[PDB]
Amino acid sequence: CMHLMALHVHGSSNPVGITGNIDRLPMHPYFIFKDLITVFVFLLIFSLFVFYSPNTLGHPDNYIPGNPMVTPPSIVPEWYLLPFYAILRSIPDKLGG
């Protein structure tokens, strides 16, 4: 909500970068029906994942109940946190990491 307030105070930018004030459009007939294209594409891909191969993004080892006495061969976060995890390992010092 705070994000949307800070967006509404000054509006959104443009692919051209220049000021949009010269030509601005309402949102109900425009960019709500573009929002619907984007939403339905999102849901279509989301269905291709959820219904078909839903565990592709996850890691199989997560289906083995947690056991502190046996560490798995490798520890990786869920995919979207992998970059930062990599950074964490790039720095030797733990505090540095």
Binding site: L25, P26, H28, P29, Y30
Partner: protein, 416 residues
């Protein structure tokens, strides 16, 4: 009363003993609608040249309408016959008058007029609305032409225009006032001598929903206009279209009756003073029309609110118009028709327009009888057919930043 003289020209007169002044004029159809982009404004220039001739005491004026043109010689009743001869002469020597004419001065006059219609905000808005609505066809052209096209006209162009359009089959002598019709007809017959020719084919035109925005932020108001494909002079809904327009009627915020005018839109727009003024109209051409409103909004932040409320009130046309509104509209349209037909100049112009463009003129009593036959269900049927959910043409001049683009206003035409 009608009399077809020799040459086949028709003299149509509406004589009334109570007329204050008399008028007689020759109209030869073929206004701007008969022109094309390169030679636009030639009809107005030719009519101005003819009307600039010596008046012999009468008042010779040019008409310059969209679809027809003519020269009208107003004069007191007893002088009418003389005026008759005058215009007859002016039209029997039209080619000579044009040839001997230095079009310079007349062209600066016509350019001044064309600038005038491009400065008066309502004239500019309505001209742009007509141009965009019928874009691609001759009917889109200005009545008086553009400043760019007027300066490019020459005598040979006017001569060709006269030869094509100033023919017996395409010309009518209209008259009104207090005089004997036979005397005027005889006086004109002895003096009228114009070339033979077939009535020029009237060019086609088709409405096209469109939007034109001349946003000038330097103006003090927002002059907008919104209209749908109306009813032409031929359509039997003509008076029905006028009744539908009058249902919403006029409004001027600063007028005393602004707080008491019947139309619901007037009461709606005065709550926050959304609009400064507006007027609903049903412009009717020979075969097509524009039915809508013009409006001037002072507060630049309320153009969208006015458009929303006006189009909602239009939506009411097909659902919820009451017998009170229909009766008021009928009475107001009858009164407006009778007002438009008081001045002898207006009566002559009306006779010429009708006789040229529809061939027959319905007397005022016949028009009253036709209007009084309208019921509320007829108005709602017309609203369903022509107003409900039909494409609109829009125009705006200044401070129209708040005039939301087409789709908003167009979708307002069908939401309940």
């Amino acid at each position: 009363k009608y009399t077809t003289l020799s040459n086949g020209v028709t003299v149509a007169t509406e004589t009334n003993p109570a007329a204050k002044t008399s008028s007689v004029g020759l109209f030869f159809g073929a206004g701007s609608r008969s022109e094309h982009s390169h030679s636009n404004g030639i009809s107005a220039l030719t009519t101005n040249v003819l009307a600039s001739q010596s008046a012999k005491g009468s008042l010779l004026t040019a008409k310059n309408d969209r679809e027809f043109n003519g020269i009208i010689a107003q004069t007191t009743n007893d002088n009418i016959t003389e005026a008759g001869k005058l215009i007859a002469s002016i039209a029997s020597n039209a080619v000579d008058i044009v040839e001997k004419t230095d079009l310079t001065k007349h062209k600066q006059y016509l350019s001044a007029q064309a600038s005038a219609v491009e400065a008066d905000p309502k004239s500019k808005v309505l001209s742009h609305l007509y141009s965009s609505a019928f874009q691609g066809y001759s009917l889109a052209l200005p009545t008086l032409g553009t400043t760019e096209s007027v300066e490019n006209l020459e005598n040979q162009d006017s001569l060709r225009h006269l030869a094509k359009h100033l023919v017996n089959n395409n010309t009518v002598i209209a008259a009104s006032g207090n005089f004997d019709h036979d005397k005027l007809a005889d006086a004109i017959e002895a003096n009228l001598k114009i070339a033979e020719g077939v009535k020029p084919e009237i060019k086609p035109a088709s409405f096209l929903g469109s939007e034109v925005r001349m946003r000038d932020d330097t103006l003090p108001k927002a002059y907008i206009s919104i209209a749908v494909h109306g009813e032409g002079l031929n359509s039997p809904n003509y008076y029905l279209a006028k009744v539908a327009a009058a249902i919403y009627g006029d409004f001027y915020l600063h007028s005393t009756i602004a707080k008491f005018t019947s139309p619901k839109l007037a009461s709606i727009v005065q709550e926050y003073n959304i609009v400064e003024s507006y007027n609903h109209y049903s412009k009717s051409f020979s075969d097509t029309g524009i039915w809508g409103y013009y409006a001037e909004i002072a507060d630049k932040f309320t153009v969208d609110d006015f458009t929303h409320f006006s189009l909602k009130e239009w939506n009411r046309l097909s659902i919820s118009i009451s017998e009170a509104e229909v009766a008021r509209a009928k009475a107001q349209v009858k009164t407006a028709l009778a007002k438009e037909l008081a001045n002898s100049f207006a009566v002559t112009s009306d006779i010429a327009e009708k006789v040229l463009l529809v061939g027959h003129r319905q007397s005022l009593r016949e028009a009253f009888e036709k209007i009084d036959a309208i019921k509320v269900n007829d108005v709602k049927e017309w609203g369903k057919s022509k107003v409900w959910d039909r494409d609109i043409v829009i125009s705006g001049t200044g401070l129209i930043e708040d005039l939301l683009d087409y789709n908003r206003n167009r979708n307002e035409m069908a939401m309940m």
